[PDB]
Scaffold this motif. Structure first.
Motif, PDB file in Angstrom:
ATOM      1  N   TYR A 195      11.932  27.882 -73.974  1.00 59.90           N
ATOM      2  CA  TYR A 195      12.431  26.540 -73.841  1.00 59.90           C
ATOM      3  C   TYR A 195      12.756  26.215 -72.408  1.00 59.90           C
ATOM      4  N   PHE A 196      13.030  27.265 -71.623  1.00 59.87           N
ATOM      5  CA  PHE A 196      13.493  27.067 -70.261  1.00 59.87           C
ATOM      6  C   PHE A 196      12.471  27.361 -69.199  1.00 59.87           C
ATOM      7  N   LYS A 197      11.264  27.722 -69.641  1.00 58.89           N
ATOM      8  CA  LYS A 197      10.099  27.946 -68.764  1.00 58.89           C
ATOM      9  C   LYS A 197       9.778  26.705 -67.902  1.00 58.89           C
ATOM     10  N   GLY A 198       9.644  26.924 -66.589  1.00 62.35           N
ATOM     11  CA  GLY A 198       9.008  25.949 -65.716  1.00 62.35           C
ATOM     12  C   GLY A 198       7.526  25.708 -66.024  1.00 62.35           C
ATOM     13  N   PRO A 199       7.018  24.509 -65.715  1.00 59.14           N
ATOM     14  CA  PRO A 199       5.569  24.272 -65.899  1.00 59.14           C
ATOM     15  C   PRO A 199       4.649  25.246 -65.123  1.00 59.14           C
ATOM     16  N   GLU A 200       5.051  25.684 -63.919  1.00 57.89           N
ATOM     17  CA  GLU A 200       4.248  26.648 -63.147  1.00 57.89           C
ATOM     18  C   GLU A 200       3.963  27.958 -63.944  1.00 57.89           C
ATOM     19  N   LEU A 201       4.877  28.331 -64.849  1.00 56.18           N
ATOM     20  CA  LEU A 201       4.658  29.481 -65.690  1.00 56.18           C
ATOM     21  C   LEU A 201       3.685  29.079 -66.838  1.00 56.18           C
ATOM     22  N   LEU A 202       3.877  27.868 -67.356  1.00 58.06           N
ATOM     23  CA  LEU A 202       3.207  27.459 -68.573  1.00 58.06           C
ATOM     24  C   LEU A 202       1.717  27.185 -68.226  1.00 58.06           C
ATOM     25  N   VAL A 203       1.500  26.998 -66.929  1.00 58.48           N
ATOM     26  CA  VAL A 203       0.197  26.688 -66.380  1.00 58.48           C
ATOM     27  C   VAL A 203      -0.432  27.951 -65.671  1.00 58.48           C
ATOM     28  N   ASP A 204       0.226  29.102 -65.903  1.00 57.69           N
ATOM     29  CA  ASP A 204      -0.065  30.443 -65.334  1.00 57.69           C
ATOM     30  C   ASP A 204      -0.101  30.539 -63.848  1.00 57.69           C
ATOM     31  N   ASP A 255      -1.910  15.538 -62.234  1.00 59.42           N
ATOM     32  CA  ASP A 255      -1.835  15.492 -60.763  1.00 59.42           C
ATOM     33  C   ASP A 255      -1.202  16.725 -60.128  1.00 59.42           C
ATOM     34  N   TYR A 256      -0.495  17.494 -60.936  1.00 60.09           N
ATOM     35  CA  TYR A 256       0.170  18.676 -60.474  1.00 60.09           C
ATOM     36  C   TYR A 256      -0.868  19.772 -60.525  1.00 60.09           C
ATOM     37  N   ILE A 257      -1.599  19.806 -61.628  1.00 58.57           N
ATOM     38  CA  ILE A 257      -2.772  20.617 -61.811  1.00 58.57           C
ATOM     39  C   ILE A 257      -3.841  20.330 -60.749  1.00 58.57           C
ATOM     40  N   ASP A 258      -3.798  19.127 -60.216  1.00 59.10           N
ATOM     41  CA  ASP A 258      -4.757  18.685 -59.239  1.00 59.10           C
ATOM     42  C   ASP A 258      -4.417  19.204 -57.851  1.00 59.10           C
ATOM     43  N   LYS A 259      -3.133  19.166 -57.516  1.00 56.08           N
ATOM     44  CA  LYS A 259      -2.692  19.538 -56.185  1.00 56.08           C
ATOM     45  C   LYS A 259      -2.808  21.030 -55.923  1.00 56.08           C
ATOM     46  N   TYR A 260      -2.731  21.841 -56.961  1.00 60.03           N
ATOM     47  CA  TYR A 260      -2.691  23.262 -56.678  1.00 60.03           C
ATOM     48  C   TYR A 260      -3.947  23.939 -57.198  1.00 60.03           C
ATOM     49  N   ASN A 261      -4.973  23.103 -57.394  1.00 60.80           N
ATOM     50  CA  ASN A 261      -6.269  23.552 -57.922  1.00 60.80           C
ATOM     51  C   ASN A 261      -6.085  24.592 -59.047  1.00 60.80           C
ATOM     52  N   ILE A 262      -5.061  24.357 -59.861  1.00 61.71           N
ATOM     53  CA  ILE A 262      -4.707  25.173 -61.018  1.00 61.71           C
ATOM     54  C   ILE A 262      -5.689  24.862 -62.133  1.00 61.71           C
ATOM     55  N   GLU A 263      -6.314  25.899 -62.664  1.00 60.81           N
ATOM     56  CA  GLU A 263      -7.324  25.659 -63.632  1.00 60.81           C
ATOM     57  C   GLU A 263      -6.781  25.997 -65.003  1.00 60.81           C
ATOM     58  N   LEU A 264      -6.918  25.069 -65.929  1.00 60.69           N
ATOM     59  CA  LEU A 264      -6.297  25.192 -67.230  1.00 60.69           C
ATOM     60  C   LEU A 264      -7.267  25.609 -68.360  1.00 60.69           C
ATOM     61  N   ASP A 265      -6.870  26.593 -69.160  1.00 59.63           N
ATOM     62  CA  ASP A 265      -7.651  26.951 -70.356  1.00 59.63           C
ATOM     63  C   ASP A 265      -8.063  25.691 -71.120  1.00 59.63           C
ATOM     64  N   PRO A 266      -9.349  25.630 -71.507  1.00 58.53           N
ATOM     65  CA  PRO A 266      -9.905  24.448 -72.110  1.00 58.53           C
ATOM     66  C   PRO A 266      -9.196  24.018 -73.415  1.00 58.53           C
ATOM     67  N   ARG A 267      -8.743  24.959 -74.236  1.00 64.28           N
ATOM     68  CA  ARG A 267      -8.033  24.608 -75.478  1.00 64.28           C
ATOM     69  C   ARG A 267      -6.852  23.625 -75.249  1.00 64.28           C
ATOM     70  N   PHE A 268      -6.171  23.773 -74.097  1.00 61.58           N
ATOM     71  CA  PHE A 268      -5.035  22.915 -73.668  1.00 61.58           C
ATOM     72  C   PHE A 268      -5.381  21.438 -73.598  1.00 61.58           C
ATOM     73  N   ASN A 269      -6.636  21.132 -73.304  1.00 63.95           N
ATOM     74  CA  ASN A 269      -7.143  19.756 -73.292  1.00 63.95           C
ATOM     75  C   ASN A 269      -6.887  18.916 -74.552  1.00 63.95           C
ATOM     76  N   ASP A 270      -7.060  19.508 -75.732  1.00 60.94           N
ATOM     77  CA  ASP A 270      -7.035  18.750 -76.982  1.00 60.94           C
ATOM     78  C   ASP A 270      -5.634  18.578 -77.568  1.00 60.94           C
ATOM     79  N   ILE A 271      -4.771  19.573 -77.352  1.00 55.56           N
ATOM     80  CA  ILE A 271      -3.381  19.522 -77.791  1.00 55.56           C
ATOM     81  C   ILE A 271      -2.567  18.618 -76.865  1.00 55.56           C
ATOM     82  N   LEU A 272      -2.935  18.636 -75.580  1.00 59.07           N
ATOM     83  CA  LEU A 272      -2.179  17.956 -74.542  1.00 59.07           C
ATOM     84  C   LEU A 272      -2.178  16.441 -74.730  1.00 59.07           C
TER      85      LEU A 272
END
Ligand SMILES: COc1ccc(/C=C2\Oc3cc(OCC(=O)O)ccc3C2=O)cc1OC
Length: 331
Positions: A195-204, A255-272
């Motif tokens: 519950y207390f995880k930052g997005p940087e963790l959740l985005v690996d 845009d956060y994913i954009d700035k740090y060229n963080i690449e997200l597992d594709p499954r995250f696309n549909d739930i998000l």
């Protein structure tokens, strides 16, 4: 296509200009205390690496807490304790009273201050708009302290914040996940409560810094002012990101994913899905209004930011009108 590197916006090279001995907890040689000084009274909780007891100091009859350590890793044991020692005397930081070499294990036990913890069960119906401010501030001091001391806590959450409401006693506990910040360094994402995880963790995203802690705290504040525990309630790490993107909104996220060229597992696309940024007004009702204030929404609004470099620092948060009233000091 790699992820864009990141530095701590503050206190970056704190360990950098400290003698190796300060952060090389591996080379630290511990000096143990007398395990016969202490008798265990009750068990008070158990994690999955340790067991926490209520204990007694038999030389003086004082109450203490004894953290016995299921046989984990020498590296891990010395970290917590180097850190605990590096920070002893700081504001609202739990005191490590002793360290003891323990039978139960082929490993040892740490001894702490007793904090006669008002239970967060009859705390949550007594607390006031002023109370929370007071307590937010005190925990901030602790978090500025240890940040200035080159250290992320990595497990901020209301259980690691003991409070003896009766004496106005707040100490911040459980530094077993706590770790030294070195700029440039990639870290474990598997820290902190769901519950207390930052997005940087959740985005690996591993090149995080202290401001992770400001996230956690920030969720806490949300919790308390909104009377909802936890504020963000997800069923796993994927869900959790959804539960955040439903109030912060999908735009700034992407845009956060954009700035740090963080690449997200594709499954995250549909739930998000696609969600808009909700107004912080939207979560004020009649039960939690008396704790919510523009200062607060605004204060809060500056902690829960996707972009880790965007979050307020501890220093700046303590300098926020939200905290103005807070009984301002002296002799
Ligand atoms: C509501 O029930 C209680 C729960 C906890 C406490 C007190 C404490 O629990 C602790 C856990 C701690 O964990 C040490 C660690 O994990 O770092 C350290 C100190 C305390 C401590 O002072 C006291 C309580 O009142 C009986």
């Amino acid at each position: 296509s790699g992820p864009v590197p990141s530095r701590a916006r503050v206190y970056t090279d704190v360990n950098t200009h400290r003698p190796r001995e300060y952060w090389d907890y591996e080379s630290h040689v511990v000096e143990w205390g007398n395990q016969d000084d202490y008798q265990l009274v009750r068990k008070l909780g158990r994690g999955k690496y340790s067991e926490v007891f209520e204990a007694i100091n038999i030389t003086n009859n004082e109450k203490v807490v004894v953290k016995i350590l299921k046989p984990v890793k020498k590296k891990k044991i010395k970290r917590e304790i180097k850190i605990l020692e590096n920070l002893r005397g700081g504001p609202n930081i739990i005191t490590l009273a002793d360290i003891v070499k323990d039978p139960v294990s082929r490993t040892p036990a740490l001894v702490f201050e007793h904090v006669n913890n008002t239970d967060f069960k009859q705390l949550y119906q007594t607390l006031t708009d002023y109370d929370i401010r007071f307590y937010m501030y005190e925990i901030l001091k602790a978090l500025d302290y240890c940040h200035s001391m080159g250290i992320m806590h990595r497990d901020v959450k209301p259980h690691n914040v003991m409070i003896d409401h009766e004496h106005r006693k707040l100490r911040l506990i459980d530094w077993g996940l706590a770790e030294f910040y070195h700029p440039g360094q990639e870290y474990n994402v598997r820290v902190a409560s769901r519950y207390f995880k930052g997005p940087e963790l959740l985005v690996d995203y591993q090149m995080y810094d202290y401001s992770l802690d400001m996230w956690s705290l920030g969720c806490m504040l949300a919790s308390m002012i909104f009377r909802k525990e936890p504020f963000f309630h997800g069923h796993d790490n994927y869900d959790q990101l959804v539960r955040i993107a439903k109030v912060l909104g999908t735009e700034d996220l992407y845009d956060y994913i954009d700035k740090y060229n963080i690449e997200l597992d594709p499954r995250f696309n549909d739930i998000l899905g696609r969600h808009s940024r909700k107004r912080w007004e939207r979560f004020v009702h009649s039960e939690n209004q008396h704790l919510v204030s523009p200062e607060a929404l605004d204060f809060l609004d500056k902690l829960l930011r996707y972009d880790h470099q965007s979050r307020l620092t501890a220093r700046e948060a303590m300098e926020h009108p939200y905290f103005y009233t807070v009984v301002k000091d002296q002799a």
